Design goal:
part of a larger assembly; 3 chains; A alpha/beta (732); B mainly alpha (433); C alpha/beta (385); B: 433 residues; 55% helix; C: alpha/beta; six-stranded mixed β-sheet; 12 helices; binds iron/sulfur cluster; binds zinc ion; TFIIH_C1-like_dom (chain C); transcription (chain C); nucleus (chain C); DNA repair (chain C); zinc ion binding (chain C)
């Protein structure tokens, strides 16, 4: 049951956390210090619950947010697999399925090395179940999808795989025995005992990626770092719509008509046999691997699509419905570009004036979009991809709009002119994204190492039996140095009151507080800016005015790019440029997606400097409806979460460098807003012993010697740090 | 080899008399003198501000790139050279525009005046380096693809083609993105300029020793803060075992040295009937006898008045108070007998000891018949005549007088002998053909 | 706020047990602040005839004060003491003073044992600018190529004085691990008030011991920790042969004053540029020059002088320990077995074998100056066999 050595008295602090949340079917919220193996804590009891079957049943789904750390989950549990294996004697059967679908896909050297995921998987599925489903037999057009054919033969066969694999395993096994990740995974979902994949993949309302069978008997799912659920769920149902998309769609309108015109009865009587079968008994014909290729369920919590074949009986008639839609939709676009308008169910009502038959052909469209292409089975998917966007949209507008939100954003965001207007359909109820989750599941446990206010689980608007505060001791001398700055000499203004471009007199001493941090602190630092143009504003005075003149002389600097390609470059450098004779401080952005998937080690990356209040500051009026609805839920929330949204991202970013429990961390706080907000947002285990013991308005020049005093002592021989042997009560 | 013998006049003064007194050749001079300092003494001109410069100067290349309109050309590296010592294809580009800017001094300003500020599009040569660095980053792009682990460019891409989104997350900039078009253009180039300066490590990391493993992710990464690996393991009884046997040998042979043994047991044998204890009986009797004799101190009142034993005690005092007849003035020809041998023969003799130590060295292994090289077995023969002849006229120059000569030649014949010892001992191990 | 809060730090410190006996326990805590790490020795195996390499970071880190007016002033002054106390303890060794300054490395004093040469070098090293950045790669280059030509029967250890800065040197010093791991050369650094992970990985990949400077007292401790010849890695050597026993010469043996001075450019010996009158004599060159218990340049063997250097470590290993009791077994007439006094600060120091009563000033005098209990004498040598 892997105590395996001194475990820094925590597994016992989490032992009863399982036994309360699982034996009593507790939903459950865990605080966890960033300095704790996210699974060595959790899975060691979870895999212990896998062996300890209660009445009978113990499922496992797990998810996280980044596919390298997904494999890092897998990585040491293989020894945990091996650990008790020798100890309990023999070895029982196991499976953990890393199912990163859209990522690793085809071994074939022609399909494979085209860069993006979705379009190339469209080439794959167009080849498999659109070319070799339409043109079944053949020699050259059939090509060579041997791995899918191997799966079809293996469907009759019953193998038994080994343990949990990776995305590089099925790749090398593609030339050996594996029949490719997509289907070997379908056969392994049949008897899966543990699934790990992305937090995103489950939470796709666009294509409803139903992972298991809907079996809520004991559906046992585990959650780590589940911080920005809104930024998942609302963005999971967020619908962007380009004018350039529509005109391309306008161009393949009559393009598809030419396919209709050239086909007289060949694909048309193919429809006629089965469109009659659509009327007689309803059954999907694209339910092979095309169910996950097409919009599985845009609006999942519905009863059924009972009266399919909506007010539309023919195909060009159905095509005219989109002519009735799109051409009206640009009429619902182009005039509307003068005023931002937030009217979600009023739009569909005014649409009902314009659309002749509504609310059934709005909801029964995206399949009849697809199915009238399914009798074709011709059009390449990336060509058809901006169209599937559209029949997704009014389908979403058809069903869930009165609780949800329509926003129209034509004006200046990377367009200085009006050259690309856009609108968006957001949802608002991440609850209603996670209510079907909860109804499909048993009672499933969030763990977030950043979540200090427990009051934000009712921002998820849900119920909780178990929600406490995890308190761990530190006989490791001192876990960390949290250091709120508040300079008095250079007069702290670190919140953007006079904003990131309103004055540079604020900015005259962020270099000073950094270079001295650079001068003292060795061994690589990853700091967090607010945004890319903020970052662009950050270094804007830094070149022309004299700033780097000692900064490059002390360590070096790793610019992270708006483009993720060049952003991954310095990364290749930073893991190297620290581990050689160079400190090489990396420079980065909190809210940007450079802040996940890393888990910095004492090897490289052991200090973080705050820069400003880490709040949104960018997207207009996505607030107000989201604001007023929680004001329709709890009514004093303007002040409230608009603190915590910064805070939930802060230690999400900031509290990352410390792992194990001796790994160090210098998480200083250059901030103007600290009085309650930083204190509310910091962990109750972390405000208590460490944050502002007697160090609040710590001018950097004074705070210089703090880290000096910190490290020099803390780099002395560590004879023993909270050594546990046998069980001696202690009772916390 | 010749700049070595000219910049150093002391070693040249050593190198003179092998040509002046014709001791050895230059071929023999660089055959057995240097041989080690070819790595040690030549370790100055090669390093020179750490060559294979990757992460030493690169910290200071940007702050020390400009003092003034002509603040350049310090020494060798001064402030321009290691800039050239990193860029290679860009060094070919420098060579391309030196005639474009005519004067090299003009090039030093022009080629670096506009590239320093924002952007350099005035000359083909400046544009050559400018366009190349975009290709360099394009070239640097391909190398980062080959590593491809712990790189969330992979991990980010899986979440954006899937809904066809995160193009709005790019296109969502606040704060007046309408009418400037200045620093938007500028800063990304400075972003690009310092990423060049960042990849200038990468542009010089290949210079190190080509530095390649490119990271196939090594899928273990076992978080080992625990475990107690405890890297060093001494104390498996190594000097415990020495102490058990050497003090045992210091027990059974306690100081078998010069006076340390031979006087020791000889007087222990003189103790004689000590196991018989008849001497020890009389001892313990004499322990009991003068037991009382000390404490009374009437016998030890007058254990002083023997002026009979003062005169002799005064005598060897006075005898050692005046030693006489031992050449009080022992020097006073030594100044002449210093400056004449310490003009050449201090260095001349040193010509031998740079060689004769190696002459001891090849014979220090020769009967094993391993270090038996033709380079060495005739180097036995080579300097043998090259030294023992060239001393004979320095020997014969000082036998101008007789007792002025015969004192110092008692001490020089070791040089003749340690030569002939080696030669004499050479055939004690008779070498075959 | 802070005008009170600056003096809330004084409120508790100044105040104590009031009424009577004030500012008393504050002095007791200062004595309770004392008594830091004692010895924790007891080792075996290796440590013999070291060949040390002083490596000095000369950088801009020296300009910070932090202990002294210069960090070299903290460094350089006690190195002379470290030199002398080394030559006190370990004369069978020699030390390479090598200085890094401006991204290069200058082997300042060669690998040798002549103290005055080393100390005046430090006295020359006073007015050093320490311009430029540290480069260890040039330092290891000298360290390789010099010790490359040393025998494998030599102890191969390197003492680096690093000012905790960026290790500013190219050319794959991470690959110098396998260079020097194979070369069986140990490398020990201590960081000046901070840590370098790569250098910390270097020493933990070495077997050399790394530390961080805490204070000037603490600076002395690790020097003192590295005075002792440490048990380095196994399979270095066993023996070292042709240890030349010399002769002193009086130059008055048979022929009284037949030579005005025994250094006239022809005599066997007379190595260094100075006049001499005959004091010494080596076996193999038969080298007569100024007396030196080290080695020579023509016989090239080791001028061993046994009572000095074959005596120094010869009792530096075989130590034992005492014990402490606060009790009162009043052995003597409330006395000490050594100095014969009493204060009774409950540290009645009893030997492990002969079990004799000592004080701190008798324990320190053993454990720093006498290095053995003489109570074992009269107790070992009488039944010894
Ligand atoms: S099915 Fe398996 S092989 Fe065939 S395309 Fe998709 S990956 Fe490439
Ligand atoms: Zn000799
Ligand atoms: Zn005592
Ligand atoms: Zn004793």
């Amino acid at each position: 049951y892997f105590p395996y050595d001194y475990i820094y008295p925590e597994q016992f602090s989490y032992m009863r956390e399982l036994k309360r949340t699982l034996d009593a079917k507790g939903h459950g919220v865990l605080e966890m210090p960033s300095g704790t193996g996210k699974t060595v804590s959790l899975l060691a009891l979870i895999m212990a619950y896998q062996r300890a079957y209660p009445l009978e049943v113990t499922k496992l789904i797990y998810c996280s947010r980044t596919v390298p750390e997904i494999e890092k989950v897998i990585e040491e549990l293989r020894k945990l697999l091996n650990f008790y294996e020798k100890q309990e004697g023999e070895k029982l059967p196991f499976l953990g399925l890393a199912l990163s679908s859209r990522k690793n896909l085809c071994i074939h050297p022609e399909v494979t090395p085209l860069r993006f995921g979705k379009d190339v998987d469209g080439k794959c599925h167009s080849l498999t179940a659109s070319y070799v489903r339409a043109q079944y037999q053949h020699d050259t057009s059939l090509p060579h999808c041997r791995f899918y054919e191997e799966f079809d033969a293996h469907g009759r066969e019953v193998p038994l795989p080994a343990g949990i694999y990776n995305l590089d395993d099925l790749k090398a096994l593609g030339r050996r025995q594996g029949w490719c990740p997509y289907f070997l995974a379908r056969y392994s979902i049949l008897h899966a005992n543990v699934v790990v994949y992305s937090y995103h993949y489950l939470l796709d309302p666009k294509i409803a990626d139903l992972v298991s069978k809907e079996l809520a008997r004991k559906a046992v799912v585990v959650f780590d770092e589940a911080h920005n659920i809104d930024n998942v769920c609302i963005d999971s149902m967020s619908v962007n719509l380009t004018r350039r998309t529509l005109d391309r769609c306008q161009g393949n309108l009559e393009t598809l008509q030419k396919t209709v015109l050239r086909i007289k009865e060949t694909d048309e009587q193919r429809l006629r046999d089965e469109y009659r079968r659509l009327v007689e008994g309803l059954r999907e014909a694209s339910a092979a691997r095309e169910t996950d290729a097409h919009l599985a369920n845009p609006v999942l919590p519905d009863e059924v699509l009972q009266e399919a074949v909506p007010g539309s009986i023919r195909t060009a008639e159905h095509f005219l419905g989109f002519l009735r839609r799109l051409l009206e939709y640009v009429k619902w676009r182009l005039r509307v570009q003068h005023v931002v308008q937030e009217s979600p169910p009023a739009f569909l009502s005014g649409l009902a004036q314009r659309v002749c038959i509504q609310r059934k052909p709005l909801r029964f469209c995206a399949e009849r979009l697809r199915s009238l292409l399914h009798t074709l089975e011709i059009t390449d998917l990336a060509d058809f991809s901006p169209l599937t966007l559209l029949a997704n949209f009014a389908t979403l507008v058809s069903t869930y709009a009165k609780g949800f939100t329509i926003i129209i954003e034509p004006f200046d965001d990377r367009t200085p002119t009006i050259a690309n207007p856009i609108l968006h359909f957001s949802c608002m109820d991440a609850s209603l994204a996670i209510k079907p989750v909860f109804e499909r599941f048993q009672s499933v446990i969030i763990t977030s190492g950043t979540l200090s206010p427990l009051d934000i689980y009712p921002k998820i608007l849900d119920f909780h039996p178990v929600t406490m505060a995890t308190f761990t001791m530190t006989l490791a001398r001192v876990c960390l140095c949290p250091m709120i700055i508040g300079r008095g000499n250079d007069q702290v203004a670190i919140s953007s009151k006079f904003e990131t471009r309103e004055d540079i007199a604020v900015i005259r001493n962020y270099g000073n507080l950094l270079l001295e941090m650079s001068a003292v602190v060795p061994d690589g630092i990853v700091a967090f800016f607010t945004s890319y143009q903020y970052m662009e504003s950050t270094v804007a005075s830094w070149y022309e005015q004299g700033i780097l003149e000692n900064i490059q002389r002390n360590k070096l600097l790793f610019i992270e790019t708006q483009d993720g390609a060049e952003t991954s470059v310095a990364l290749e450098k930073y893991q190297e440029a620290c581990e050689n004779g160079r400190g090489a401080i990396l420079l980065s952005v909190a809210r940007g997606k450079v802040s996940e998937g890393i888990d910095f080690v004492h090897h490289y990356g052991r200090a973080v400097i705050m820069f400003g209040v880490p709040y949104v500051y960018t997207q207009s009026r996505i607030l107000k409806a989201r604001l007023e609805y929680l004001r329709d839920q709890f009514q004093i929330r303007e002040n409230d979460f608009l603190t915590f949204d910064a805070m939930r991202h802060a230690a999400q970013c900031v509290g990352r460098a410390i792992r194990g429990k001796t790994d160090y961390g210098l998480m200083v706080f250059a901030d103007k807003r600290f009085a309650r907000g930083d204190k509310r947002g910091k962990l109750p285990r972390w405000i208590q012993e460490h944050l502002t013991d007697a160090n609040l308005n710590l001018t950097v020049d004074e705070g210089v010697q703090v880290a000096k005093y910190f490290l020099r002592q803390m780099a002395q021989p560590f004879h023993r740090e909270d050594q546990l042997g046998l069980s001696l009560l202690s009772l916390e | 080899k010749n700049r070595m013998l000219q910049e150093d006049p002391v070693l040249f003064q050593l190198y003179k008399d092998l040509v002046v007194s014709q001791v050895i050749s230059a071929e023999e001079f660089w055959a057995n003198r240097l041989n080690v300092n070819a790595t040690d003494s030549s370790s100055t001109s090669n390093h020179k501000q750490d060559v294979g410069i990757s992460a030493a100067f690169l910290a200071d290349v940007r702050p020390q790139t400009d003092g003034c309109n002509g603040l350049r050309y310090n020494l060798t590296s001064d402030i321009i050279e290691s800039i050239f010592r990193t860029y290679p294809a860009v060094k070919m580009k420098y060579a391309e525009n030196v005639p474009h800017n005519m004067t090299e001094k003009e090039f030093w300003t022009r080629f670096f005046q506009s590239h320093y500020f924002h952007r350099d599009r005035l000359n083909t040569g400046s544009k050559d380096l400018f366009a190349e660095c975009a290709k360099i980053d394009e070239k640097g792009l391909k190398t980062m693809v080959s590593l491809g682990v712990k790189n969330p460019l992979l991990d980010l891409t899986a979440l954006e083609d899937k809904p066809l989104d995160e193009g709005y997350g790019i296109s969502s900039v606040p704060s007046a993105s309408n009418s400037k078009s200045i620093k938007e253009n500028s800063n990304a180039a400075i972003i690009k300029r310092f990423n060049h300066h960042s990849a200038m490590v990468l542009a010089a990391g290949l210079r190190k020793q080509e530095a390649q493993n490119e990271q196939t992710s090594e899928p273990s990464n076992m978080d080992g803060n625990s475990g107690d690996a405890d890297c060093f393991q001494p104390a498996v009884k190594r000097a415990k075992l020495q102490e058990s046997i050497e003090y045992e040998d210091l027990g059974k042979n306690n100081s078998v040295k010069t006076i340390a043994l031979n006087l020791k047991k000889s007087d222990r044998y003189y103790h004689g009937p000590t196991p018989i204890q008849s001497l020890q009986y009389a001892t313990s009797q004499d322990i009991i006898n003068s037991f009382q004799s000390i404490r009374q101190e009437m016998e030890a009142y007058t254990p002083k008045l023997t002026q009979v034993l003062s005169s002799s005690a005064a005598s060897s005092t006075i005898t050692a108070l005046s030693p006489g007849g031992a050449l009080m003035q022992g020097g006073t020809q030594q100044a002449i007998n210093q400056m004449v041998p310490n003009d050449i023969q201090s260095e001349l003799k040193h010509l031998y000891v740079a060689v004769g130590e190696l002459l001891r060295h090849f014979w220090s292994c020769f009967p094993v018949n391993t270090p038996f090289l033709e380079e060495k077995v005739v180097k036995m023969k080579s300097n043998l005549e090259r030294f023992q002849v060239t001393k004979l006229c320095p020997f014969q120059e000082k036998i101008r007088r007789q007792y002025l000569s015969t004192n110092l030649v008692s001490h020089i014949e070791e040089m003749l002998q340690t030569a002939y010892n080696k030669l004499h001992t050479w055939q004690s191990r008779r070498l075959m053909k | 706020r802070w005008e009170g809060g600056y003096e809330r730090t004084w409120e508790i410190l100044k105040e104590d047990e009031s009424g009577s006996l004030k500012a008393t326990i504050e002095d007791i805590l200062f004595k309770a602040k004392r008594k830091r790490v004692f010895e924790h020795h007891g080792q075996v195996r290796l440590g013999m005839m070291r060949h040390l390499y002083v490596v000095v970071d000369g950088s801009r880190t020296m300009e910070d004060q932090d202990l002294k007016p210069n960090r070299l002033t903290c460094t350089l002054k006690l190195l002379e003491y470290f030199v002398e106390e080394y030559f006190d303890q370990n004369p069978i060794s020699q030390i390479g003073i090598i200085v890094t300054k401006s991204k290069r490395a200058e082997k300042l004093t060669e690998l040798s044992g002549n103290p005055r040469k080393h100390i005046t070098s430090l006295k020359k090293a006073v007015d050093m600018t320490c311009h430029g950045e540290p480069s260890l790669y040039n330092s290891l280059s000298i360290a390789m190529q010099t010790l490359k030509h040393m025998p494998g029967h030599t102890s191969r250890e390197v003492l680096i004085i690093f000012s905790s800065l960026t290790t500013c040197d190219p050319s794959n010093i991470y690959d110098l691990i396998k260079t020097l791991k194979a070369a069986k050369i140990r490398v020990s650094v201590i960081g000046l008030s901070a840590e370098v992970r790569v250098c910390t990985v270097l020493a933990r990949e070495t077997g050399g011991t790394y530390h961080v400077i805490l204070d000037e007292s603490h600076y002395k401790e690790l020097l003192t920790h590295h005075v002792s010849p440490p048990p380095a890695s196994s399979s270095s050597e066993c023996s070292l042969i042709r240890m030349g026993f010399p002769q002193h010469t009086i130059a008055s043996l048979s022929d009284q004053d037949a030579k005005p001075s025994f250094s006239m450019a022809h005599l066997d010996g007379n190595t260094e540029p100075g006049l001499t009158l005959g004091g010494y004599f080596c076996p193999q060159c038969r080298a007569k020059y100024c007396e030196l218990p080290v080695e020579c340049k023509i016989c090239g063997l080791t001028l061993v002088s046994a009572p000095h250097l074959a005596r120094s470590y010869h009792h530096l290993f075989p130590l034992d320990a005492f014990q402490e009791i606060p009790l009162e077994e009043y052995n003597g007439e409330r006395f000490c077995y050594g100095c014969q006094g009493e204060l009774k600060d409950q540290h009645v120091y009893v030997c492990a074998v002969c079990q004799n009563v000592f004080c701190v000033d008798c324990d320190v005098f053993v454990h720093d100056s006498l290095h053995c209990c003489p109570g074992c004498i009269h107790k070992i040598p009488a039944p010894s066999g």
